[PDB]
Coordinates of C-alpha atoms and ligand atoms in Angstrom, one line a residue:
Chain A
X1 CA -26.6 22.7 22.1
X2 CA -26.0 21.0 18.7
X3 CA -25.2 23.5 16.0
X4 CA -25.2 22.8 12.3
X5 CA -22.4 24.2 10.3
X6 CA -22.0 23.7 6.6
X7 CA -19.2 21.1 6.2
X8 CA -15.8 22.5 5.4
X9 CA -13.3 21.2 2.8
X10 CA -11.6 18.7 5.1
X11 CA -14.7 17.6 7.2
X12 CA -16.3 16.7 3.9
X13 CA -13.5 14.6 2.4
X14 CA -13.1 12.6 5.6
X15 CA -16.9 12.2 5.8
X16 CA -16.9 11.0 2.2
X17 CA -14.3 8.3 2.9
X18 CA -16.2 7.4 6.0
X19 CA -19.9 7.1 4.8
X20 CA -18.6 5.6 1.6
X21 CA -17.1 2.6 3.4
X22 CA -20.0 2.6 5.9
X23 CA -22.8 2.6 3.4
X24 CA -21.1 -0.4 1.8
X25 CA -20.9 -2.3 5.0
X26 CA -24.5 -1.4 5.8
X27 CA -25.6 -2.8 2.4
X28 CA -23.7 -6.0 3.2
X29 CA -25.3 -6.4 6.6
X30 CA -28.7 -5.8 5.0
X31 CA -27.9 -8.6 2.6
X32 CA -28.5 -6.5 -0.5
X33 CA -24.9 -6.2 -1.8
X34 CA -22.1 -8.7 -1.9
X35 CA -18.9 -8.1 0.2
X36 CA -16.5 -8.1 -2.8
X37 CA -18.8 -5.5 -4.4
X38 CA -19.9 -3.3 -1.5
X39 CA -16.9 -1.0 -1.6
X40 CA -17.0 -0.3 -5.3
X41 CA -20.8 0.1 -5.6
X42 CA -20.8 2.5 -2.7
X43 CA -18.1 4.8 -4.1
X44 CA -20.1 5.1 -7.3
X45 CA -23.4 5.8 -5.6
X46 CA -21.9 8.7 -3.6
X47 CA -19.9 10.0 -6.6
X48 CA -23.1 10.2 -8.7
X49 CA -25.0 11.8 -5.9
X50 CA -22.3 14.3 -5.3
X51 CA -20.5 15.0 -8.7
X52 CA -19.5 18.3 -7.4
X53 CA -19.0 17.4 -3.7
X54 CA -20.2 20.3 -1.6
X55 CA -20.9 22.4 -4.8
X56 CA -23.6 19.9 -5.8
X57 CA -26.8 22.0 -5.9
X58 CA -29.8 21.4 -3.5
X59 CA -27.6 19.2 -1.3
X60 CA -26.8 20.4 2.2
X61 CA -24.0 18.7 4.2
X62 CA -23.6 19.7 7.9
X63 CA -21.1 18.8 10.6
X64 CA -23.1 18.5 13.8
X65 CA -21.0 20.5 16.4
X66 CA -21.5 20.4 20.1
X67 CA -19.1 23.3 20.3
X68 CA -16.0 24.3 18.3
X69 CA -13.6 21.5 19.0
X70 CA -16.2 18.7 19.3
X71 CA -17.7 17.4 16.0
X72 CA -20.3 15.0 17.3
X73 CA -21.6 13.9 13.9
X74 CA -22.9 14.6 10.5
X75 CA -26.1 15.5 8.7
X76 CA -26.8 15.4 4.9
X77 CA -30.1 16.3 3.5
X78 CA -31.3 17.0 -0.1
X79 CA -33.9 19.7 -0.6
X80 CA -35.9 18.5 -3.7
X81 CA -36.2 21.2 -6.4
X82 CA -39.6 22.8 -5.9
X83 CA -40.8 19.5 -4.4
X84 CA -44.7 19.4 -4.5
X85 CA -44.6 19.0 -0.7
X86 CA -41.4 21.0 -0.1
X87 CA -39.9 17.7 1.2
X88 CA -36.2 17.0 1.8
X89 CA -34.7 13.6 2.0
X90 CA -32.1 12.9 4.7
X91 CA -29.3 11.0 2.9
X92 CA -27.3 10.5 6.1
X93 CA -27.3 11.3 9.8
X94 CA -25.3 10.1 12.7
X95 CA -22.7 10.7 15.5
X96 CA -19.1 9.5 15.6
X97 CA -18.6 6.6 18.0
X98 CA -16.9 8.7 20.7
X99 CA -20.0 10.9 21.2
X100 CA -22.9 8.4 21.2
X101 CA -24.7 7.5 24.4
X102 CA -25.2 11.0 25.6
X103 CA -28.4 11.7 23.8
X104 CA -26.9 14.2 21.4
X105 CA -28.6 12.3 18.5
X106 CA -32.0 13.3 19.5
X107 CA -30.8 16.8 20.1
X108 CA -29.3 16.8 16.6
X109 CA -32.7 15.7 15.3
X110 CA -34.4 18.7 16.9
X111 CA -31.9 21.1 15.3
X112 CA -32.5 19.4 12.0
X113 CA -36.2 20.2 12.2
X114 CA -35.5 23.7 13.3
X115 CA -32.9 24.3 10.6
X116 CA -35.1 22.6 7.9
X117 CA -38.2 24.6 8.7
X118 CA -36.3 27.9 8.7
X119 CA -35.3 26.9 5.1
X120 CA -38.9 26.3 4.0
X121 CA -38.7 22.5 4.2
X122 CA -42.1 21.3 5.4
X123 CA -41.4 17.5 5.4
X124 CA -38.5 15.2 6.0
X125 CA -38.0 11.8 4.4
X126 CA -35.3 9.2 5.1
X127 CA -34.0 5.7 4.6
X128 CA -32.9 3.5 7.5
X129 CA -31.6 -0.1 7.3
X130 CA -34.0 -2.3 9.2
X131 CA -31.1 -3.8 11.1
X132 CA -30.4 -0.4 12.7
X133 CA -33.1 -0.9 15.3
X134 CA -31.7 1.7 17.7
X135 CA -31.7 4.3 15.1
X136 CA -35.2 3.3 14.0
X137 CA -36.5 3.8 17.6
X138 CA -34.9 7.2 17.8
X139 CA -36.6 8.3 14.6
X140 CA -40.0 7.0 15.7
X141 CA -39.6 8.7 19.1
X142 CA -38.9 12.0 17.4
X143 CA -41.9 11.8 15.2
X144 CA -40.9 9.9 12.1
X145 CA -43.3 7.3 10.7
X146 CA -42.7 4.4 8.4
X147 CA -44.1 4.6 4.9
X148 CA -42.4 1.8 3.0
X149 CA -40.6 -1.4 4.0
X150 CA -38.5 -3.7 1.9
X151 CA -38.2 -7.3 3.0
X152 CA -36.6 -10.6 1.7
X153 CA -35.8 -14.2 2.6
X154 CA -33.5 -17.0 1.4
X155 CA -35.1 -20.1 0.0
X156 CA -33.9 -23.7 0.0
Chain B
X1 CA 0.8 -4.9 11.5
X2 CA -1.8 -5.0 14.3
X3 CA -0.4 -4.5 17.8
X4 CA -2.0 -5.9 21.0
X5 CA -1.5 -3.5 23.9
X6 CA -3.2 -4.2 27.3
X7 CA -6.0 -1.6 27.9
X8 CA -5.3 1.2 30.4
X9 CA -7.9 2.3 32.9
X10 CA -8.8 5.1 30.6
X11 CA -9.6 2.8 27.7
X12 CA -11.3 0.1 29.7
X13 CA -14.1 2.4 31.2
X14 CA -14.8 3.8 27.7
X15 CA -14.6 0.3 26.2
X16 CA -17.1 -1.0 28.9
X17 CA -19.7 1.7 28.0
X18 CA -19.2 1.0 24.4
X19 CA -19.3 -2.8 24.5
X20 CA -22.1 -2.9 27.0
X21 CA -24.4 -0.6 25.0
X22 CA -23.5 -2.6 21.9
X23 CA -24.2 -6.0 23.5
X24 CA -27.7 -4.9 24.5
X25 CA -28.3 -3.9 20.9
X26 CA -27.1 -7.3 19.8
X27 CA -29.3 -9.2 22.2
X28 CA -32.3 -7.2 21.1
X29 CA -31.5 -7.8 17.5
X30 CA -31.2 -11.6 18.1
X31 CA -34.6 -11.3 19.8
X32 CA -33.0 -12.6 23.0
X33 CA -33.7 -9.5 25.2
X34 CA -36.5 -7.0 25.1
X35 CA -35.4 -3.4 24.4
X36 CA -36.6 -2.2 27.8
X37 CA -34.5 -4.9 29.4
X38 CA -31.4 -4.9 27.1
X39 CA -29.5 -2.1 28.7
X40 CA -29.8 -3.3 32.3
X41 CA -29.2 -6.9 31.5
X42 CA -26.1 -5.9 29.6
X43 CA -24.2 -4.1 32.4
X44 CA -24.8 -7.0 34.7
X45 CA -23.4 -9.6 32.3
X46 CA -20.2 -7.5 31.8
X47 CA -20.1 -6.6 35.5
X48 CA -20.3 -10.2 36.7
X49 CA -17.8 -11.3 34.0
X50 CA -15.5 -8.5 35.0
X51 CA -15.8 -7.9 38.8
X52 CA -12.5 -6.0 39.3
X53 CA -12.6 -4.8 35.7
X54 CA -9.1 -5.0 34.3
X55 CA -7.9 -6.7 37.5
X56 CA -10.2 -9.6 37.0
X57 CA -7.6 -12.4 36.8
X58 CA -7.2 -14.5 33.6
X59 CA -8.9 -11.8 31.5
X60 CA -6.9 -10.0 28.9
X61 CA -8.4 -7.0 27.3
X62 CA -6.2 -5.4 24.5
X63 CA -6.5 -2.4 22.4
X64 CA -5.6 -3.2 18.8
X65 CA -3.3 -0.6 17.2
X66 CA -2.1 -0.2 13.6
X67 CA 0.5 2.1 14.9
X68 CA 1.0 4.4 17.9
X69 CA -1.9 6.6 16.7
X70 CA -4.5 4.5 15.0
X71 CA -6.4 2.3 17.4
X72 CA -8.3 0.0 15.0
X73 CA -10.2 -2.0 17.7
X74 CA -10.4 -4.1 20.8
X75 CA -9.8 -7.7 21.8
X76 CA -10.9 -9.4 25.0
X77 CA -10.1 -13.0 25.8
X78 CA -10.4 -15.2 28.8
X79 CA -8.0 -18.1 29.6
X80 CA -9.8 -20.3 32.2
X81 CA -7.8 -21.9 35.0
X82 CA -5.9 -25.0 33.9
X83 CA -8.2 -25.6 31.0
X84 CA -8.0 -29.3 29.7
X85 CA -7.3 -28.0 26.2
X86 CA -5.6 -24.8 27.1
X87 CA -8.5 -23.1 25.4
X88 CA -9.4 -19.4 25.8
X89 CA -12.7 -17.7 25.1
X90 CA -13.0 -14.6 23.0
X91 CA -15.5 -12.5 24.9
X92 CA -15.2 -9.6 22.5
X93 CA -13.5 -8.6 19.2
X94 CA -14.1 -6.0 16.6
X95 CA -12.8 -2.8 15.1
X96 CA -14.1 0.7 15.3
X97 CA -16.3 2.0 12.5
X98 CA -13.6 4.3 11.0
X99 CA -11.1 1.4 10.6
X100 CA -13.4 -1.3 9.1
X101 CA -13.4 -2.1 5.4
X102 CA -9.6 -2.4 5.1
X103 CA -9.0 -6.0 6.0
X104 CA -7.5 -5.2 9.4
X105 CA -10.0 -7.5 11.1
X106 CA -8.5 -10.6 9.6
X107 CA -5.0 -9.3 10.3
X108 CA -6.1 -8.6 13.9
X109 CA -7.3 -12.2 14.1
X110 CA -3.8 -13.4 13.1
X111 CA -2.2 -11.3 15.8
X112 CA -4.7 -13.0 18.1
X113 CA -3.4 -16.5 17.2
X114 CA 0.1 -15.4 17.5
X115 CA -0.5 -13.9 21.0
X116 CA -2.5 -16.9 22.3
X117 CA 0.2 -19.3 21.2
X118 CA 2.9 -17.2 22.9
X119 CA 1.0 -17.5 26.1
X120 CA 0.2 -21.2 26.1
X121 CA -3.3 -21.1 24.7
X122 CA -3.8 -24.1 22.4
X123 CA -7.4 -23.4 21.3
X124 CA -9.8 -20.5 20.8
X125 CA -13.5 -20.4 21.4
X126 CA -16.0 -17.6 20.8
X127 CA -19.7 -16.6 20.4
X128 CA -21.2 -14.8 17.4
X129 CA -24.8 -13.7 16.9
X130 CA -26.4 -15.5 14.0
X131 CA -27.3 -12.2 12.5
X132 CA -23.7 -11.1 12.5
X133 CA -23.2 -12.6 9.0
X134 CA -20.1 -10.7 8.1
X135 CA -18.4 -11.7 11.4
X136 CA -19.3 -15.4 10.9
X137 CA -17.8 -15.5 7.5
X138 CA -14.6 -13.8 8.7
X139 CA -14.3 -16.3 11.5
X140 CA -15.0 -19.1 9.1
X141 CA -12.3 -17.8 6.7
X142 CA -9.7 -17.6 9.4
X143 CA -10.2 -21.2 10.4
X144 CA -13.0 -21.1 13.0
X145 CA -15.7 -23.8 12.8
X146 CA -19.2 -23.9 14.1
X147 CA -19.7 -26.3 17.0
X148 CA -22.9 -25.1 18.8
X149 CA -26.0 -23.4 17.3
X150 CA -28.9 -21.9 19.3
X151 CA -32.1 -21.3 17.5
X152 CA -35.6 -19.9 18.4
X153 CA -39.1 -19.7 16.9
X154 CA -42.0 -17.4 17.9
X155 CA -45.5 -18.8 17.9
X156 CA -48.6 -17.1 16.4
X157 CA -50.5 -14.8 18.7
Chain C
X1 CA -14.1 -0.3 -17.2
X2 CA -11.9 1.1 -14.5
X3 CA -13.2 2.2 -11.1
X4 CA -11.7 3.3 -7.8
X5 CA -12.0 1.4 -4.5
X6 CA -10.2 1.8 -1.2
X7 CA -7.0 -0.2 -1.3
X8 CA -6.9 -3.1 1.2
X9 CA -4.2 -3.8 3.8
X10 CA -2.8 -6.9 2.1
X11 CA -2.8 -5.2 -1.3
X12 CA -1.0 -2.2 0.3
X13 CA 1.5 -4.7 1.7
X14 CA 2.2 -6.1 -1.7
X15 CA 1.9 -2.7 -3.3
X16 CA 4.3 -0.9 -1.0
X17 CA 6.8 -3.6 -1.8
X18 CA 6.4 -3.7 -5.5
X19 CA 6.5 0.1 -5.5
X20 CA 9.3 0.8 -3.0
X21 CA 11.5 -1.4 -5.2
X22 CA 10.5 0.2 -8.4
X23 CA 11.1 3.7 -7.1
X24 CA 14.6 2.5 -6.4
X25 CA 15.0 1.1 -9.9
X26 CA 14.0 4.5 -11.3
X27 CA 16.0 6.5 -8.9
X28 CA 19.0 4.5 -10.1
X29 CA 18.2 4.7 -13.8
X30 CA 18.2 8.5 -13.3
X31 CA 21.5 8.6 -11.4
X32 CA 19.9 10.4 -8.5
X33 CA 20.7 7.5 -6.2
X34 CA 23.5 5.0 -6.3
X35 CA 22.6 1.4 -7.1
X36 CA 23.7 0.3 -3.6
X37 CA 21.7 2.9 -1.7
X38 CA 18.4 3.1 -3.6
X39 CA 16.6 0.2 -2.0
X40 CA 17.4 1.8 1.4
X41 CA 16.3 5.3 0.5
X42 CA 13.0 4.2 -1.2
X43 CA 11.9 2.6 2.1
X44 CA 12.7 5.8 4.0
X45 CA 10.8 7.9 1.5
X46 CA 7.7 5.7 1.6
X47 CA 7.7 5.3 5.3
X48 CA 8.0 9.1 5.7
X49 CA 5.1 9.6 3.3
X50 CA 2.9 7.1 5.0
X51 CA 3.6 7.1 8.7
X52 CA 0.2 5.7 9.5
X53 CA 0.1 3.5 6.4
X54 CA -3.3 3.6 4.7
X55 CA -4.5 5.6 7.6
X56 CA -2.2 8.4 6.9
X57 CA -4.5 11.5 6.9
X58 CA -5.3 13.2 3.7
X59 CA -3.7 10.4 1.6
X60 CA -6.0 8.4 -0.6
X61 CA -4.7 5.0 -1.8
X62 CA -7.0 3.3 -4.3
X63 CA -6.8 -0.1 -6.1
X64 CA -7.8 0.1 -9.8
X65 CA -10.3 -2.6 -10.6
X66 CA -11.3 -3.8 -14.0
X67 CA -13.7 -6.4 -12.5
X68 CA -14.6 -8.1 -9.3
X69 CA -12.1 -10.8 -10.2
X70 CA -8.8 -8.8 -10.0
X71 CA -7.4 -5.4 -9.4
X72 CA -5.5 -4.1 -12.4
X73 CA -3.6 -1.2 -10.7
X74 CA -3.1 1.5 -8.1
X75 CA -3.6 5.2 -7.6
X76 CA -2.3 7.2 -4.7
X77 CA -3.2 10.9 -4.2
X78 CA -2.7 13.4 -1.4
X79 CA -5.1 16.3 -0.9
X80 CA -3.1 18.9 0.8
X81 CA -5.4 20.4 3.5
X82 CA -6.3 24.1 2.8
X83 CA -4.4 24.2 -0.5
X84 CA -4.9 27.6 -2.1
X85 CA -5.7 25.9 -5.4
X86 CA -7.4 22.8 -4.0
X87 CA -5.0 20.6 -5.8
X88 CA -4.1 17.0 -5.0
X89 CA -0.7 15.5 -5.7
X90 CA -0.4 12.1 -7.4
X91 CA 2.2 10.3 -5.4
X92 CA 1.9 7.1 -7.4
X93 CA -0.1 5.6 -10.3
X94 CA 0.4 2.4 -12.3
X95 CA -1.0 -0.8 -13.6
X96 CA 0.5 -4.2 -13.2
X97 CA 2.3 -5.5 -16.4
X98 CA -0.4 -8.1 -17.3
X99 CA -2.9 -5.2 -17.2
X100 CA -0.8 -2.7 -19.1
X101 CA -1.1 -1.5 -22.7
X102 CA -4.9 -1.9 -22.9
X103 CA -5.8 1.7 -22.3
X104 CA -6.8 1.3 -18.7
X105 CA -4.4 4.1 -17.6
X106 CA -6.4 6.7 -19.4
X107 CA -9.6 5.3 -18.0
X108 CA -8.1 5.5 -14.5
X109 CA -7.1 9.2 -15.0
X110 CA -10.7 9.8 -16.1
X111 CA -11.9 8.1 -13.0
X112 CA -9.4 10.2 -11.0
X113 CA -10.8 13.4 -12.5
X114 CA -14.3 12.3 -11.6
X115 CA -13.3 11.4 -8.1
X116 CA -11.3 14.6 -7.6
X117 CA -14.2 16.7 -8.7
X118 CA -16.6 14.9 -6.2
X119 CA -13.9 15.5 -3.5
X120 CA -13.7 19.2 -4.3
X121 CA -10.2 19.0 -5.8
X122 CA -9.8 21.4 -8.7
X123 CA -6.2 20.7 -9.6
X124 CA -3.9 17.8 -10.0
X125 CA -0.1 17.5 -9.9
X126 CA 2.4 14.7 -10.1
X127 CA 6.0 13.7 -10.4
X128 CA 7.4 11.4 -13.2
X129 CA 10.9 10.5 -13.9
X130 CA 12.2 11.9 -17.2
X131 CA 13.1 8.5 -18.6
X132 CA 9.5 7.4 -18.2
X133 CA 8.5 8.8 -21.6
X134 CA 5.5 6.5 -21.8
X135 CA 3.8 8.1 -18.8
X136 CA 4.9 11.6 -19.8
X137 CA 3.1 11.3 -23.1
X138 CA -0.1 9.8 -21.6
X139 CA -0.1 12.6 -19.0
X140 CA 0.2 15.3 -21.6
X141 CA -2.5 13.5 -23.5
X142 CA -4.8 13.8 -20.5
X143 CA -4.3 17.5 -20.1
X144 CA -1.3 17.4 -17.8
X145 CA 1.5 19.9 -18.5
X146 CA 5.1 20.4 -17.4
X147 CA 5.8 23.0 -14.7
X148 CA 9.1 22.1 -13.2
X149 CA 12.2 20.1 -14.4
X150 CA 15.1 18.7 -12.5
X151 CA 18.3 18.2 -14.5
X152 CA 21.7 16.8 -13.6
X153 CA 25.1 16.4 -15.2
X154 CA 28.1 14.3 -14.3
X155 CA 31.3 16.3 -14.5
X156 CA 33.8 13.5 -13.7
Chain D
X1 CA 26.7 -13.3 -14.4
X2 CA 23.4 -14.4 -12.9
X3 CA 23.7 -16.9 -10.0
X4 CA 21.7 -18.7 -7.3
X5 CA 21.5 -17.6 -3.7
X6 CA 19.1 -19.1 -1.0
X7 CA 15.9 -17.1 -1.0
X8 CA 15.4 -14.9 2.1
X9 CA 12.3 -15.1 4.3
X10 CA 11.4 -11.5 3.3
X11 CA 11.8 -12.1 -0.4
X12 CA 9.9 -15.4 0.0
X13 CA 6.8 -13.7 1.5
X14 CA 6.6 -11.2 -1.3
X15 CA 7.4 -13.9 -3.8
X16 CA 5.0 -16.5 -2.5
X17 CA 2.2 -13.9 -2.6
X18 CA 3.2 -12.7 -6.1
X19 CA 3.5 -16.3 -7.5
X20 CA 0.2 -17.4 -5.9
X21 CA -1.6 -14.4 -7.5
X22 CA 0.1 -15.0 -10.8
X23 CA -0.7 -18.7 -10.8
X24 CA -4.4 -17.8 -10.3
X25 CA -4.3 -15.4 -13.3
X26 CA -2.7 -18.0 -15.5
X27 CA -5.2 -20.6 -14.4
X28 CA -8.1 -18.2 -15.0
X29 CA -6.7 -17.2 -18.4
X30 CA -6.3 -20.8 -19.6
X31 CA -9.9 -21.2 -18.6
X32 CA -8.9 -24.1 -16.3
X33 CA -10.1 -22.3 -13.2
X34 CA -13.1 -20.0 -12.5
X35 CA -12.4 -16.4 -11.5
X36 CA -14.2 -16.7 -8.1
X37 CA -12.0 -19.7 -7.2
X38 CA -8.7 -18.9 -8.7
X39 CA -7.4 -17.0 -5.7
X40 CA -8.5 -19.5 -3.0
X41 CA -7.6 -22.6 -5.1
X42 CA -4.1 -21.2 -5.9
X43 CA -3.3 -20.8 -2.2
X44 CA -4.1 -24.5 -1.6
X45 CA -1.8 -25.4 -4.4
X46 CA 1.2 -23.6 -2.9
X47 CA 0.6 -24.4 0.7
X48 CA 0.7 -28.1 -0.2
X49 CA 3.9 -27.8 -2.2
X50 CA 5.6 -25.8 0.6
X51 CA 4.1 -27.1 3.9
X52 CA 7.3 -25.7 5.6
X53 CA 7.8 -22.6 3.5
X54 CA 11.5 -22.3 2.5
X55 CA 12.4 -25.2 4.8
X56 CA 10.3 -27.7 2.7
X57 CA 12.8 -30.6 2.2
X58 CA 14.1 -31.3 -1.3
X59 CA 12.7 -27.9 -2.4
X60 CA 15.2 -25.2 -3.3
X61 CA 14.1 -21.6 -3.6
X62 CA 16.7 -19.3 -5.0
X63 CA 16.8 -15.6 -5.9
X64 CA 18.3 -14.7 -9.2
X65 CA 20.9 -11.8 -9.2
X66 CA 23.8 -10.7 -11.4
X67 CA 26.0 -9.3 -8.7
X68 CA 25.0 -9.9 -5.0
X69 CA 23.0 -6.7 -4.9
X70 CA 20.3 -6.9 -7.6
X71 CA 17.7 -9.6 -7.1
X72 CA 16.1 -9.7 -10.5
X73 CA 14.3 -13.1 -10.4
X74 CA 13.6 -16.4 -8.8
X75 CA 14.2 -20.2 -9.4
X76 CA 12.2 -22.8 -7.6
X77 CA 13.3 -26.4 -8.0
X78 CA 12.3 -29.7 -6.5
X79 CA 14.9 -32.6 -6.5
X80 CA 12.8 -35.5 -5.3
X81 CA 14.4 -37.8 -2.8
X82 CA 15.8 -40.8 -4.7
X83 CA 14.3 -40.2 -8.1
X84 CA 14.5 -43.2 -10.6
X85 CA 15.9 -40.7 -13.2
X86 CA 17.6 -38.2 -10.9
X87 CA 15.3 -35.5 -12.2
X88 CA 14.5 -32.1 -10.7
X89 CA 11.2 -30.4 -11.4
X90 CA 11.2 -26.6 -11.8
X91 CA 8.1 -25.4 -10.1
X92 CA 8.7 -21.8 -10.9
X93 CA 11.0 -19.5 -12.7
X94 CA 11.1 -15.9 -13.8
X95 CA 12.3 -12.3 -13.3
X96 CA 10.5 -9.2 -11.9
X97 CA 8.8 -6.6 -14.1
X98 CA 11.6 -4.1 -13.9
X99 CA 14.1 -6.8 -15.0
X100 CA 13.1 -8.4 -18.4
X101 CA 14.4 -8.7 -21.9
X102 CA 17.9 -8.1 -20.6
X103 CA 18.6 -11.7 -21.4
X104 CA 18.8 -12.7 -17.7
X105 CA 16.6 -15.8 -18.2
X106 CA 19.0 -17.4 -20.6
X107 CA 21.9 -16.8 -18.1
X108 CA 19.6 -18.0 -15.3
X109 CA 18.9 -21.3 -17.0
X110 CA 22.6 -21.7 -17.5
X111 CA 23.3 -21.2 -13.8
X112 CA 20.5 -23.8 -13.3
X113 CA 22.3 -26.2 -15.6
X114 CA 25.5 -25.6 -13.6
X115 CA 23.8 -26.0 -10.2
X116 CA 21.7 -29.0 -11.3
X117 CA 24.8 -30.7 -12.5
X118 CA 26.6 -30.0 -9.2
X119 CA 23.8 -31.5 -7.1
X120 CA 23.5 -34.7 -9.2
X121 CA 20.5 -33.7 -11.2
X122 CA 20.7 -35.7 -14.4
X123 CA 17.4 -34.4 -15.9
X124 CA 15.2 -31.3 -15.6
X125 CA 11.5 -31.1 -16.0
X126 CA 8.9 -28.2 -15.8
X127 CA 5.4 -27.1 -16.6
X128 CA 4.7 -24.0 -18.7
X129 CA 1.2 -22.7 -19.4
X130 CA 0.2 -22.8 -23.0
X131 CA -0.2 -19.0 -23.4
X132 CA 3.3 -18.5 -22.1
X133 CA 4.9 -18.4 -25.6
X134 CA 7.8 -16.3 -24.4
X135 CA 8.9 -18.9 -21.8
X136 CA 8.2 -21.7 -24.2
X137 CA 10.6 -20.3 -26.8
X138 CA 13.2 -19.8 -24.1
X139 CA 13.1 -23.4 -22.9
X140 CA 13.3 -24.8 -26.4
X141 CA 16.4 -22.8 -27.0
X142 CA 18.0 -24.2 -23.9
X143 CA 17.3 -27.7 -25.0
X144 CA 13.9 -28.4 -23.4
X145 CA 11.5 -30.6 -25.1
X146 CA 7.7 -31.1 -24.8
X147 CA 6.6 -34.4 -23.4
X148 CA 3.0 -33.9 -22.3
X149 CA 0.2 -31.5 -23.2
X150 CA -3.1 -30.6 -21.6
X151 CA -5.9 -29.4 -23.9
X152 CA -9.4 -28.2 -23.6
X153 CA -12.4 -27.4 -25.8
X154 CA -15.5 -25.5 -24.6
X155 CA -18.7 -26.8 -26.1
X156 CA -20.8 -23.9 -24.8
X157 CA -20.3 -21.7 -21.7
Ligands
LIG201 CL1 -11.7 7.6 -0.4

């Protein structure tokens, strides 16, 4: 069973250093940002989104735990303030490498729905880099549907 | 400094599951293998390439360490029998997610050269998926040059 | 402007050098260490602080960037896990000579306060040799205040 | 007094890196090089000068130090093999940040004059960036004279 627990002091900091570098690398792979810029741009994006870290209102950061000594992953959603459709955006979701391939991801996704609905969230929204095919499949399989797609192409 | 230590049975098995699952994802991304196929096709390739696993002669799978605690990545090279140019193929190389974005990859690539030379290898060869742009640039920056290019095109309907 | 970014391995290589040697030049200009021992003690001090280099847990080493053309300085803090006052200790902070005396130091401390807050850090502490009056003033200017003092006297 | 001592491989690594980075900054400052190239271009400049690091023939890389315990600077000179004027070119010279103004440079140049005289050097030459007014005044005081000048004018941007 995957339980969601509000991230603690240390789990958060480590997570911040992690997703901060990751987001940057994902933006490079997507071809949106430049290598020598990725790191810096990322830090700023996450600092602006979380001025007060865990204290930042309406933001909910969880450490997906399989049990008490196994932190399989993370989950970060933002519950819009009185959103006209009570929607929440998922800023981040995933499992640490040494826990992927067991199917916990999908289980984590079912706990998210459960935990979100108990909170009064009636809709989930999220961004996923197109190059993350595997993760796109998982989302689709668990019910998510595409709404917007960004595309590009290099010329001569 | 990045240390090359030969993988132990514990690491190998975990590495195999990792790389295999990853390779399937790469083949699908490249458009080479269909999703439904990917997974299966992947285990076979690595199984045929590594019959006896770590005991498959001429293969050298190493765990890249920054120190005795931080295992930054993996490195797997093959040194064919009496190769006319003492070349060795790099079947796999990369760092784990938590250790990327620090420049260890390039340093890990310099420990590769140092190691190959110490063992007789005079040339290195490798494969990189066209979509792996960051990797290609890294290899190009460390002196690697493109020799062969595979391309494909889908037709309408 | 001045922004933070995870320090890179080669930078850390050059940084650890340029700083292990400076910490010896200061430890000597303070009498604490003898001129013919400093260089050897500095290394022991820095190797003990960073056993896993940039991967040493809870230690955050950042390069100070002015632009995507060069890094002007460095900033190293340690967020003591479970610290009653959620304070981080500033183990090192400085700008390279060519990028000193422009006002980037204060910008960097402002960037530090912004980063600490987003990390959940509510307090900052640091060490600074007494002879380094330049830094002492700047620190007091940024809200820092003395709490402890080490003094020595040669008898013979 | 400040005297010359063959540079060590450890001091060289840190120095080469520091001089290659510094040279890029100067080049960018003079406007001669573009920011996005400075770093890469600089390396090529130093690798060609020292193909064999410290062992590059006719090149002498010394560490400056008062007593044999405080390395406060560096002196890099090239005594070309059979030079029509027996001249030695000073590729690089200076002291570290924590060692400046103490008048070591003057004492360093003197040790250079003494060493140069010992090795047969009947003439010294060097390059100094235009913005380096500090170094320029120093050299003038030690008897150096300008012979060549490079100038630029930007018409636009
Ligand atoms: Cl960080």
